[PDB]
Structures are given as structure tokens and as C-alpha cells.
């Protein structure tokens, strides 16, 4: 899908930019934001066409509250604000955001320039409340040192997992996305042996092979994030996480971003991670990772976005 907005199914990229904004209260602010997001193909092409490979993509997400301001009388089935989670040891906050721009390209300059044109076009109508410049780290790893994304669904599976279908026909082709900015405690993480780390994640570290059933702990990240319904059907989400950080501020992060046709799947993963399954048996990744943000967005299809 070349230089088309709302391309949820794009493969991983070398660079990304995650912009979360809050819209101003006026109707003028509302109208500027609407103009910009609905014509987002304009700047996407203005920047993206300059690269022969045409790698640049831009997914626009709209928060529950803001959606109500621009489409009061027509709403996707599962749009609501992000549900805060308060677990026995760790919590996932719900933090502000009216707009998400999830931008990816083969090159940092293309991300940066697209962001520059979007922010400039929004002017005073919106404020950036979170900004993360994601980068690929070695062979698709996160800063914990593990290959991150391995089990993503691909092709038809990706589309079945992430894209709204017959269950909500007026919003077919759309999706729901959750973001969380995580910061890691690297020194604590490095006190663990590699084997302890593998038991936390659920895969071997260098080789990125899922641990055997009989060595797979019940609170591993993989176990807690495997969602199987009563008919034995697995329900997957599409993740585009990227590393980020700042060396001077000792910040080493993983920007989580996950797409699903029904956000309850993602929400259940989060509940199982933060509260545990069974309750108390929580994800030991959270012993080394703290979420600074937590926001849910509806991702309209191109058609719906273009007519807002």
C-alpha cells in the first residue's frame, strides 16, 4: 500500500515517529484538526513521494472524546478511553491523547519531515503531549536484548487480527490501537542471568526460539499474552514496537503500539500482564518496565478518515 494513509498492515521499518496530541477546546481548533487529519494524504505524499522506494506511512488514530466532537452521531462499536489498570505491584496509567500519528519509513528524515508538516499545519489547534523517535535495534531487538515482534500475525492473519470486518460494517477497514511508552530499569534487568530473562519473556534470547511447553513459566510474557477462546481459537494482535531513548537522561525505552479489530483482545492481554493470570501471577517484564503513558485510539479506514 504505497503512500496511502491508514496503512495498518505495513511491515517493520528502520525508523518511526509516534506523535500524541491533545486538540484545543474551540470549534475553530476542532475544524483545523478535522481539516488536517482528513486531508492527511496531502502531506504524506508531499514528503513520501520524494523517496523512490515510497516507504513512508502514516496511520492517524482518534481518541474517544475527540471522536465525539467530530462524529457525534456515528461511532465504531468499541471506541472508549484507555482503561487504567491497578495491579498488585504495577499499574498502567490512562493518559491524555486526542490524536495519534504513527509514522514509519526507511529513513529518519522522512518521518521527521512528515511530522514537521503535520505539526506546522495543526498550529495552535493542537499540542504535542508525547513524542517518541523509534529506531530499529540490531536484528529486530528491543533494548531488553530480545527479538521483538517475532510472532506478529502476517498477511491474511494480520488483516483478520487487526482490521474491522463484518462485525461493525460502517467502520470496515478501520482498527483500534493502544500505545504505552515504557521505560526500563536496565541495571536491574542486567542483574538477571540470560536464562532468568528468557523465563521472563518466554523465548531464548539470542536465538529467539519459544521455550518448550514444559519449560515455559505460567507468568512468562508469552504465556500471559496468548489469548485462546473457549473454542480453542487464538486471538492475535499486530504490534509495531520500537526502541527509543536518551543517554544523558538514562532513558532506555520500548514504545509499545498494538493494533486489533477488537481492543478487548489487547485489553485482556494488559489485564493478564498487570493483574496476573491467575490474579497475582503478573508479567515479570513489568518488574523492569514502567509505562509512562496509556492511550486508546480508533483508526478510521481511509474512506472514513477522508470524510470526517
Amino acid at each position: 500500500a504505497r503512500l496511502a494513509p491508514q496503512a495498518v498492515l505495513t511491515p517493520p521499518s528502520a525508523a518511526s515517529l509516534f506523535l500524541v496530541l491533545v486538540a484545543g477546546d474551540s470549534d475553530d481548533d476542532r475544524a483545523t484538526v478535522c481539516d488536517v487529519i482528513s486531508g492527511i494524504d496531502g502531506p504524506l505524499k508531499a514528503v513520501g513521494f520524494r523517496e523512490l522506494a515510497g516507504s513512508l506511512s502514516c496511520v492517524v488514530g482518534v481518541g474517544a472524546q475527540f471522536w465525539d466532537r467530530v462524529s457525534a452521531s456515528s461511532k465504531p462499536a468499541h471506541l472508549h478511553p484507555f482503561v487504567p489498570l491497578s495491579g498488585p505491584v504495577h499499574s498502567a496509567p490512562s493518559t491524555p491523547g486526542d490524536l495519534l500519528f504513527h509514522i514509519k519509513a526507511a529513513r529518519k528524515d522522512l518521518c521527521f519531515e512528515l511530522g514537521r508538516q503535520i505539526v506546522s499545519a495543526l498550529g495552535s489547534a493542537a499540542t504535542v503531549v508525547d513524542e517518541v523517535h523509534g529506531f530499529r535495534y540490531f536484528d529486530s531487538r528491543d533494548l531488553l536484548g530480545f527479538v521483538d515482534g517475532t510472532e506478529n500475525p502476517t498477511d491474511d492473519d494480520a488483516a483478520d487480527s487487526a482490521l474491522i470486518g463484518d462485525e461493525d460494517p460502517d467502520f470496515r477497514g478501520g482498527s483500534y490501537v493502544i500505545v504505552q511508552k515504557y521505560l526500563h530499569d536496565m541495571s536491574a534487568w542486567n542483574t538477571l542471568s540470560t536464562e532468568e530473562q528468557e523465563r521472563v519473556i518466554g523465548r531464548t534470547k539470542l536465538e529467539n526460539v519459544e521455550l518448550d511447553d514444559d519449560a515455559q513459566p505460567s507468568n512468562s510474557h508469552v504465556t500471559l499474552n496468548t489469548i485462546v477462546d473457549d473454542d480453542g481459537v487464538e486471538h492475535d494482535i499486530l504490534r509495531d514496537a520500537m526502541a527509543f531513548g536518551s543517554l544523558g537522561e538514562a532513558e532506555y525505552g520500548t514504545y509499545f503500539i498494538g493494533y486489533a479489530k477488537d481492543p478487548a483482545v489487547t485489553e485482556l492481554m494488559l489485564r493478564r500482564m498487570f493483574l496476573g493470570e491467575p490474579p497475582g501471577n503478573y508479567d515479570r517484564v513489568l518488574d523492569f518496565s514502567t509505562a509512562a503513558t496509556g492511550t486508546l485510539f480508533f483508526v478510521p479506514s481511509r474512506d472514513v478518515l477522508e470524510s470526517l
Copy 2:
């Protein structure tokens, strides 16, 4: 996508070859021509398969007159010779062409070699009347210094704009292509300021951003080439323009090529450009650009081309 002829929807390439030929009057000439074009998959693969990436593509177009020699009692709805235009200041001529080969690849040698094999196979049955070796110029620019092709429809929009559909079902998947070889007056263009050049085109020069609605002249290239019908529906074409040139002959060119499911769209753009809207309010691009050729071809689907 790989190594199939009539692939109208291919993204922009580093190199291009445009060959326009006239066929011989005789029945033997018609027969050779018909053999070469209906078996064009042969040379396409003979050349294209030698490159791992398989970037080589070849679109064959057939003029109205030659189409009648070769497919007498079956014709696409809108196939007719290129309509010449005689405007208040500038004119677009209608020049000969029975065959078009629009060849693209990541490399020049691939273009040249495919060209060489097509020209050799045709032998005395056909004569090259126009030959242009197109090249990508910096970040997708034309020799006027502007990013050229930015607003092209992509994905579904590209297929809806370029490819014949339900409306003419015997020729579904075909297209109509117009070419015009433009020569620029570089020294005249260079006497304009960047800002005046921007007013002529409709977009900022370095940054490739569409001028604000309030700043957009009504005779800008962008305005005159925007086609909106009575119902408020926009109609687009798919362009694959490339730069070409000769330093010794001081020739600096843009080779225009545009595909549409209905040439009425392309032709209306050309009228607005050359005649003006309102009349005499013509495209100031034409003050620095002169069309040396002008030819319309029908682009059969792969299936229709192969049975001929």
C-alpha cells in the same frame, strides 16, 4: 506484479524508455507487428528475468488507426487519435504513432536491452518516430526543479482512475495513455523568482507543499489540472513523467505520460491547460514548455493484448 506486460500501475522507476513507432502499410508488416506485441511477454522475460529484483516492465499502447487494422470489429469505447489543441498563445500538436512501448526498470541497461530486442524483432515492419530515455532527477523532480508526480493516485485510487472497469467490460483492465514530449526554455524559467515559479506550478518548490487555498492562483498548473464534476467528484489520472535531455543540443525536457480509464479526463485537463479556464486563463507552465509530440494510445489488458 513481476515481469507481466501492461502493468500500468507500477510505481516510479530510476530509468525509463519511451518508444513510439509507426507501422508499415502492408499486410506482412501488420502481421509482424501483431506477432511482436501479442508475444511481448517473451522479450520482457528474456531481459527482465536476468535481474534478481525483477523491476523491468513494459506497457504496450496501440494507436486508434493501427488498432482498426488488427482488431477490426471490436474497439474500446474511447479510442480515437490525439485531439490537437490550438489555444490563444500555445498549441499542442497531434503527431503520428501506431505503437507505444513504455518501458521502466531500476537500471538503464535493462530498458535499453528490452528496447533493442523489440526494435530488432519488428525489423522493417515499423519505424521509430520518437525515442526518449527518461531518468529520475534527484528526489523525484523534473528539470524545472519541482517534485513531479506527487499527487498521483495510489493503490485502489490508482486502479479506479487508470483502468477500464464495468463501464466497458470487453476491455476491463485496459487504459488510455497520452504522451507529449515537452522541451523547456530553461533560461526563461530561470529568470523567474522561486516564488513566481511556485505560483506557476501550484506548490512550494523545495518542500513540495500545495499552496494555501487563498494563495493558489486560478491559472496554476495544479488548479487547471484539478478535475471536479457536477456532483463534486474528483477525477484523476496516473502520470509517469520523466526528465530527459541533451546538453550539446540544449534540450531540457519533461516527457509527459498519463493513463486514465477515460481519456475525456486527460483531454479536459489539456483543454484547461492550453485554452484556459476561463478562456485565455491558460497554464503558465506552457510559457516555458513546448509540446513537440502528442499521441493517444489504447493500452489493452494483458489478456486482450495476447489474443490479437
Copy 3:
């Protein structure tokens, strides 16, 4: 089709790995094999996701005999062992194989690592009986010096040629694949002039242009592998042959692998090549190429493979 098993339609790659294995006789062995092949997407991603381009692919084939052990009451319409052929001077032997892994990637390490993980997961439940590390050779040439793959069908034609459709709906999207490891007699081939080599193949050597009708021999590789039925309809196969060899053993080979929605097409090509058309007018490529293996496998669709056992 990014990192999905059974991607029969993937374009040519720089590196490939062909693994042919025989499964152990026990119920335990069969169960381990079933587990590995129906979970093949696991190692595929474990390895493939580490490369940004996601070039890695893996096609699993299952032999007729093994298929009956693991899906006794549901079988694609044309699954049978490779049919051997014997001409007077050249033969196409039928050699063992229950499992095929046809692995492709932009890089050798990716093919090797995926092979390593698969072999490791199978452990004592299967034995490697053939292993070939294929490599792209110049501009898509085989070791005879000819561009090899030129006329492969692409896109819709590739899908129409290779994949089971309405004729056998329970296995739609599957395919039948035949492999033959050919070893070349390089010094005999080198005694021919270029023009003689071109008459053997049916295309010019450097330029890879098909010889025109009047110049195309009735026993050229191209002529005998052209299949036009009574109704005048052409039937194609999808090939992904690669060069392989060992300098010290003097082995210079072409690993033939051809996919078809119905192996009758591939089998008729082989009959024409080895037995000739008219009878005895065989394919002279076989004067310089000797098949050391010959095996047929059913390639199930993803859904069918994942459901196994």
C-alpha cells in the same frame, strides 16, 4: 506473503536450501514430525523476523506414503510416489523422501539457521537423505551458462499453474512439487560450441532469446517442455531451480524443483524429455545432466498444513 509457510509463489532468491528427509517408522516419530511441520510457522518467524526485509520462506512438502500415515482418510486427488522413467541411455530414478523443506532467502545464514532449527526440532524422528545449498549464479544462470527460469509464469498465471483450485476443493491452494538433483558433465558440455548448446536448450546463450520457429529443434529442451493440450491450451509449471556444487568432488549441479496444480503436467514434461516426442526424440540436456534423485511431494495450503494431527 511475508514470513508465511507454504508460499509457493515467492520470486527467485539469492540463496536456497533443499532438505529431503525420511521419517522414522514409529508412532512417536510420526507424532514429532506432525508437530514440527504443522507448527512450521514458529521457526520460520523465529529466524525470518530477524531480517528487516523478511525475505525468508519455507515450503513444506509431504510424500504420498507419509501422508497416509498422518491423514489416512483425506488425500489430495493426485498424490502418488514419483513415477520413475527409463529411456535407453537416461533414467529418472524414484528416490526416497517423506518430507521436503524448500527454503529461500536473500542470505545464506537465514536458510542455514532455519534448516538448523528444523533439523534440531525433528531430532531422531527423521533423517536427512538429501541436502542441497543452492545459490544464484550471475544473472540468474544455471552452471550450463544459460538463464534458467525465464519463462516461468508470473502473478495470476503462476497461481493458475501451480495451485490447486476448483478441481479439488478440499485442498485448494496446495500444490504438487517434484525435485530432481541433476549433476552435469561439464567437460562434455564444454566440447559443444555455443550454437550447439543453444540448439540443445532452445534459446540463445548470452541473450536468453528463444530461437525462432524455423530454427527451433523438435528435441530442444524448450520444445519438449512445451505442453499444449488437444484443445490448444498451454499448461505451465513453476520452477525454482538453483545451481549447487563442490569443486573438490567435481560436482556441478542444477537442483530442479517444479510446482504444478496437477503433477500430470510435470510428469508429461518428464516423459517427453526422457522418452522423447516422437518416441526416441529425447532431450539432449540429458546427455549432459544425470538425475541422482527423483521425489514427489504434496504441498498443503497453510490451513491444511497447520491442521495436520
Copy 4:
């Protein structure tokens, strides 16, 4: 110069990292710093060798004050703190820094990982006071939209411009580097027409062609940064500026970094830019660019750096 520290002459890269740190006051702190910088080839290889192209490089600079703590009785001829400048409306401040790491690579992860390992090895012995992640912007442009670096000297001229030679033999192959982090006023710059911007810089914008003599303003960036001595000899510096920024903070910057065998050249350029020539005829780039830092460092040769302590 593959994976060797102090490679001042490396060509432009897609990504860079500029780290400026202040060393702790203790003997322990100094010793840890000494250990890390004189062993810098260790982390350089640990990270860089993982990339086949070996694009990663790392130049270590040491401030005048820190230098005296760790090599009290041997000092290059021109090592002194950055000399601040104050014009009537624009100033070049002198800001803290004992250590510079100027890291470049084809990829961001390589710069980041090397920075991570260096910061980690220094631990509490040094503090990061400036950190900039530079990136190539289109066709070698800065965020003002101009090609930035065009006239850099190359090969022998680069070596002649940047590296200490016979004038100071104990430090042959070293250099002096100045950094300034500039932030731009983008909306003010955008109020200029292209032609006005070109008169500010001294070259055409899209085409990056130097304005001819009759059209070149006496206060253009190019004119004021052209240094021709009394004898008519030109003196150049080697620059490796990169774009950087933050959209939410509205920070759009150029990180200036310039190497010279004698910082007098760079210092005279800065005087001309900030104070003007003739006096008051300053560089109008400064109307749109404000320096937030200003620091000078000695870049020792490999041999000198490795020998430290």
C-alpha cells in the same frame, strides 16, 4: 580507516551522535575517564564489528582544563577553552565540556549502542551535559533547506586543513574541534523569500551553486567564512554538521562541529560571523540561528590518546 578511533577524516554519515560530558572532580573519576578514553577502541570494535560495512566511527575530544589533569607536562600548542564572543545582538557562549564523543554510522542503533556502552563504562565519573542525535536530511541539507557541507576540503586538502603537522610534532595527526548547538527560528526564516535566503547563505538554495562575485554579498555566510591570509593563502576547516530536533518542543537545529589543525582559523571565522567584517557587518544566518553551546576540544591522534595515563 576501518573501526579506528580518532578518524577525523571520515566522510558524511546518515546518523551521528554528539555527546559532551563533564568529568567528576576526584582522582578516581579522572582515572576512570582516562581508562575509558584511552581504551576507546574496545567499545568501538565491540559495536562496530557487528556491521559488515564497518561504518561506525568515534572521535574523542578532550577540553583544555581536563587535559591539564591528565597530561600536565605535555600539551598541544593551541589548546585553550572556547573563546566566547558577544556582538550587539548575537553571542557565542562558552559552555562546559571536558569530553566530546563525536560518533558517526550508517545506522542509528550503532551510534546509540556505542554511546550506551561509553556512558555505561564512565558511570559516575562523568555527566552528560549535551546530547544530540544528528540525522542526514534529504540530499545533505540542513533544516534551513540548504545543502550543508558542500565546500568541505577532501582527501589531501582535508588532511592539510584538519590535522596537526610539522608545526607541533609531538601531536602530529591530532586536531582541534569546536562544537556549537544552534537552534533555528523557522517561522522567521520562512518569512524570507528563497532569493533572500540565498543572499544570507551565499549559494542558490535548490541547486547549491555559489552566487557569482557581483551577486555575492559581503556579509553572506560564505564570504565571512572564507579565510584568505596576507600571502593570499586560503585556510579551510572540516565540518560535519547535522540536523537535529524535537517537534513537540519546536526545536529545529543544526549541530555545528568543525575540525582544524589550528583553532585560530575556526576562531577567526567565528569573529567574522559574530562581529562582522568590516566591523558590524555580521553573518545574517545568526538572525535565524542562536548558539546554545560553545566548546573547544583537542582531538589527540590514536597514539597519543591510547598512551593517556
Copy 5:
């Protein structure tokens, strides 16, 4: 190596531009020409710096006659006009040229743009008399189908063969370059068998292996272009030939360009080729190739070029 003019030793490139110009008779013309060529580093960097890889190079050559206008009382030892040759069957003409720009890059646009800027800077002071856009053809082949440039000296050998040394110390680091634009008779060449073609060249065609000593004809291109002196010392030249062509004009060409520290080597090769060794035993390449131009230039070192 990067972006410095007069880089004779650069490896082969994907694209090339050969510009040969004659200068105006006047003193103003001489002055402009002298300004452009002595400041050629300017345009080289203006263009070349825009490409991260910095592949762009430009070698300036000056003909004997123009050199005398511009450096009257100081001349390299072997600078004289191209010596025409009149052999038993084939002839090599001596055509005009004051200036040569031999431009190479990984991309055509870089070549074209540098060319455009040089031609513009020269304005009316000089006229393009020959222009050739060279391109790499498959695996380093010429349009005769043979790998072209195989035996080129590399590294120290390339410097010893091409660059003026101790023997003429005022011009150290300079070179002498000969160009000839050859046009092929493709249909005649194609009537030879591969084996006969191999006998003509001196090497196997696909495999690019030198024929066995016993199988190597004495009139092969390889034999006639091997120069061994009395002492048994071989003398080599550095060639940078490129294919060029026009399909409509049926022009298939090899642009020959050869650098030597002493043109006596190149000239002897040309005599052996055109006159034969023994006399009349000439290069059978010349039966399928006709030289349309022939010009000799001195290539000053960077230092000598810049003070002029």
C-alpha cells in the same frame, strides 16, 4: 578519493558522461574557459555532495592547441594533437576537441546535472562538439557482448601505467587521455558465431577467459593491444569504456577512453590495431567498429589544473 577533480584512477561506474568541447577564438572565451576548468572543484562539489556515497567524479582534459593558449611557456612532454591513422582497410580520424569532461557517478542525474552546470558556466565561450551518455551494460559488458575492461591495471599498476611520474616532474600526477567514439555494425557482428567472435576479441565470451596461448590469433584484439618492450616489460593503459546507443537511429556504440602516462603506448596500440602487426594483420574488431571521433587531451594534476 571523494569529490576531487582529476581522479583518473576511479573504479568503473554505472553511468558516465563524455563531453568534448571546442573553445572560442577570443581572449574573453579563453578567460571564461580558464575560470571554469581551474575552479571545476566548485561544480563537482555543488553536485556531488548531494549524494551520500559521493560517487561523482570529473576528469578535465585539455587539448594541445588550447593548452598553448593558456599555459604558453610550460608544457608536458608528450602533449600533441591526436595522430590520425590510415590503415589498409580501416581509418582512425583526428577530430576537434579543446576540452574533455569525463564524468562518472553511480547515477545518471548526477552526471547530467554536473554536465548541465559546466555547460551553463561556459556559456558562449565553448561549444559541445561530442556528447556521449555511457551506461554499464549487464556484467561490465560492451554492446558486442564481451566483458569490457577486464585486464585493466589496478592499484599500484594503475598508478604506474596512467600517471606521469619522475620522468616529467613538473606534471607529476597528470595523464594523457585518448577518446574514440566507436559505432558498431551489429547485424554484421551477429552473423559471426560465438567462436569466431572469441577469435576476434581474444577471450571467451560468456566466461571472459583469455584464450590459450596456442589458440590465440595473432591478429586478436588482445594480442594486438599487448605491448611488450625490448626488455620484456609490459606497458598498460587504463580504460574506462562505456556502452551508448540510440535505438531509432540504430546506433550501438562503445565509447573508448584510455589513460596512459605516455601516449606513445596508446598510439602504438592504435597502430597495431589499424595498421596491423605484421602490416595488414589488423584488428578484426575494426571490421565491426568504426571510429567517429579521435582526440587526445592532457589531464593535469589537480594542482596544475587549479593554477591556470
Copy 6:
């Protein structure tokens, strides 16, 4: 150093080929081998020139015995056969080899083709006794999972470490190389924890960081292979090791190849590894790696090779 034989200092490559041969006993065999190796630039260019990047290199090594047959009266200072080592637990055999070809390129086909032409040109005059097709494994790792080559000397250090200098002036520019084909016990290796493995090697596994002094065991691979003279000067070697293997034969290998201007440095490393320092404290890498071959070759400079 482009397409030049005996390029010892080339950086790591994606592919390599290691060919070890024994020459036949006749004087005819001796003469054929001499012809081939001394003209090795012929096939190097015949194959290498076909790749634009020109990555192909070929280093020829000559064994002690064979050298005596072709240069009986002139010998480099340290040429002798490989010294077998018999340690408390492991041994390094000395195995046959008259010729080494160490071939590297960006592509397997270039290695293979060069090898093909060499073996063909040697015909019956020599027999291949060992053949290994090396490949790059992920981010420069060996099959033990560790980055392999990290501490290689580079630039001036590489030349000082590997190339014969003033100490043996008649062979300046040459080198000495040792090869050992190692096969690993992967199952035994994988019983170790990552931390145990790191203590065996002397560096962290994923991060490839040398262990601290106080955690660096005295029998680690790194400790045993660090060679410091009595003046505190370290003596380094240049290694080009590559992974190889065969999945059907359960072969997972590391082909060791190491260059030094004085092979005593390499030999001392081997003694310390196999016998231990102090005696008995041997390299625990050898508990998981067995050397199947062991051969020493002299690497002549280009000049010396070309005049054999």
C-alpha cells in the same frame, strides 16, 4: 586494493571459499601449478571484473615443502610445516597442503566461479584435499553464537601485525597464514549456560563486550590468545574466520584462518590454547571444537608471486 592478488588486509565478507590442494610429484605438475599461481591475477580479474563493486579477492598461500620445489635458493625467514600439538586433553594435527586459496567476495557465485576456474586450470597437476564454503552468520557471529573477529587489528595495526617488513626485506609485503578447520559439538556447547560460555570465550555473548579484568578467567580464549612481550608490547594476528556446515552430516564448523608477519605469534597462541598457560590451563573452547586440519602457508607478495 581492487582485484589484486595477495590482498591480505581485506575487510570481512559475506562469503568466502577456502581451498587446500596438494601438488603432483612430476616436474610437469610443478610447472603447471607455478604457471597458475603466478598468473593468478588472470582468473581473479576474469571473474572479479564482472561485479561492479569489485569485491572479489584471492590470497595464494604456498606450503614449506612445495616452496622448496619452486624457489629452492630463496626462502622467507619463517617458512616451515605446521607444528602438530599434543596437549593434555586436545591435539592440533598437522595435515597436508601445498597450496591455499583464500577467496572472499560479497557473493557466493563469485567465490565459486573463481574456484571453478582455478581448479580447472590446475587440472591433474593438483588435488583438492580440503574445501570449505564460508558464510557470514548474522551480525558477524560464529556458530557458537559469539561475534567472531571483534578485536582484529585494523589499518596500520593490521599491516604491522600481518605484513612482512624490514625484518625480512626480500619478502616484504608477504605474510604467513595458518588454517584449521574446526567442528563443534553443538549439543555439549548448548548444555552450558550463557554465562559459562562467556567465561569460556572471555566476552559477553549478545553484547560482545570484553569481560572485566576481575571476571576474566585465566584460561578464557581471550586471555590465552593475548600475546604480550617482555617490553609490554602486544602482538596481534589478523583473522578471517567464517562459519560453515552441513545439516545432514550434523557438521557445524568454524574455519579458522590467521595471518601474521611472524607465525611464531600465531604458533604461541595455539600452544597456549592447546597446552595451556600455565601448562594444563588450556582453552575451554577446545572442549567443544575439534580441529580436523592444521596447515601453515607462506603468502608471497604480489611481486614475488608473479615471478615464481
